[PDB]
């Protein structure tokens, strides 16, 4: 973290990729870090996509409120993620829509 000489968003991204929450808690979240506007929101989106419950909890405790973060566009992005544990949502969408589903289809909230 120190040797990269990078910003706090980059350190948070590194600690999120390593899935190490104590590193972010004791080194990245300290007094006076001066995050850029919209950086904690992006980190929350990234932690939501990658199934990082500890980082979601840590970010919630450190300022970001889910009422402002969650929009329609962000929920649409969340439903169309490819990084994470396998699920069966695509088969359900194909079954409900009764076929006719081309590849790279965007699962709208109406389909959900």
């Amino acid at each position: 973290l120190k040797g990269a000489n990078a910003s706090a968003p980059d350190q948070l991204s590194l600690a999120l990729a390593w899935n190490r929450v104590d590193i972010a808690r004791s080194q990245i979240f300290i007094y006076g870090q001066q995050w850029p506007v919209g950086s904690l929101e992006q980190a929350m989106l990234d932690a939501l996509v990658l199934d990082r419950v500890d980082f979601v909890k840590l970010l919630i405790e450190n300022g970001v409120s889910m009422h402002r973060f969650l929009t329609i566009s962000r929920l649409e992005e969340l439903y169309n993620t490819r990084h994470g544990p396998s699920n069966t949502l695509y088969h359900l969408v194909r079954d409900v829509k009764k076929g006719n589903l081309p590849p790279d289809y965007r699962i709208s909230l109406i389909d959900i």
């Binding site: 007094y31 006076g32 909890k57 919630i60 450190n62 300022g63 970001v64 409120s65």
Partner: protein
């Protein structure tokens, strides 16, 4: 200007939900002028907010600027204060803004809420001109969402969460302190004269707790000691600021060239006169030291001082 302010009625009172950290803590608040009569404030806190009169009052003072406390001291200060205010029906008075000792009181309340039942009647008395959002609070009696995220570039500060009630005092200006010290001290004096349920005749006990501090901490300590009812105070040694100065002056009672600390206007300006005036009444000043002396518990130190 020469205090030329419009005396309009209040336009900010209700409840706020602190959106932010992992809690949902309501906080009833009002805005009142810095010249209000404490009888009305006590009536509000007793009947409208529905709070019983306290069996104990704790006043917490400290430095306005943000500082840090070493480990193994904050965990025995916060838990001691929480135990003292929980085992006893007590009201805690604090600055309210999320700076200085108020942050430590806030995290002490945060650590207790996740491990024990009950509630602590923490009361914040902050000037109205230092809240980071004067707007989003100018609504009438209705629940208002409030954000705990702090922007260091705003040159203001946010209200500390985990506070049960707020008294926001205004004098017209915006961005400077000094609109609540008179009101806070007058409310403390008025509630000290209030009669407890016991028919002996004793009033509500008042204690003062000092962590860190500044040049004005000596002044408020001397004001506490010089009141017609003396108010015992409790200081700490590990802070390093004027509280440590008081702790060092506790030793070797009745060394004047030691006043140079690169802290005030050289040796030309000195607070040694008021420090010695405080020390002339040393049976009221208490101190807390870790392991060096007795009373290794803050709640024991607070209760024995009363």
């Amino acid at each position: 200007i020469s205090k030329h302010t419009q005396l309009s009625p209040t336009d900010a009172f209700g409840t706020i939900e602190f959106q932010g950290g992992g809690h949902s803590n309501k906080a009833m608040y009002v805005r009142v002028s810095f010249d209000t009569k404490p009888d009305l404030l006590l009536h509000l806190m007793t009947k409208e907010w529905q709070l019983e009169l306290p069996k104990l009052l704790i006043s917490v003072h400290g430095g306005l600027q943000n500082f840090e406390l070493q480990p193994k001291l904050k965990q025995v200060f916060g838990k001691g204060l929480i135990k003292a205010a929980m085992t006893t029906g007590a009201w805690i008075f604090t600055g309210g803004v999320n700076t200085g000792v108020i942050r430590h009181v806030g995290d002490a309340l945060k650590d207790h809420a996740s491990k024990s039942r009950g509630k602590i009647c923490t009361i914040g008395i902050a000037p109205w001109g230092i809240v980071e959002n004067q707007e989003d609070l100018i609504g009438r009696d209705v629940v208002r969402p409030y954000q705990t995220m702090s922007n260091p570039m705003s040159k203001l500060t946010v209200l500390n969460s985990m506070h049960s009630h707020f008294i926001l005092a205004d004098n017209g200006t915006t961005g400077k302190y000094g609109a609540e010290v008179k009101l806070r001290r007058q409310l403390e004096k008025h509630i000290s004269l209030q009669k407890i349920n016991t028919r002996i005749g004793q009033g509500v006990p008042v204690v003062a707790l000092i962590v860190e501090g500044g040049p004005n901490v000596i002044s408020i300590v001397l004001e506490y000691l010089r009141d017609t009812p003396p108010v015992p105070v409790v200081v700490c040694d590990g802070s390093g600021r004027a509280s440590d100065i008081l702790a060092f002056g506790h030793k070797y009672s009745e060394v004047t060239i030691q006043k140079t600390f690169t802290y005030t206007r050289t040796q030309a300006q000195h607070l040694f006169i008021i420090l010695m005036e405080c020390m002339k009444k040393k049976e009221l000043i208490t101190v807390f030291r870790m392991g060096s002396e007795g009373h290794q518990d803050i709640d024991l130190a607070i209760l024995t001082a009363l």
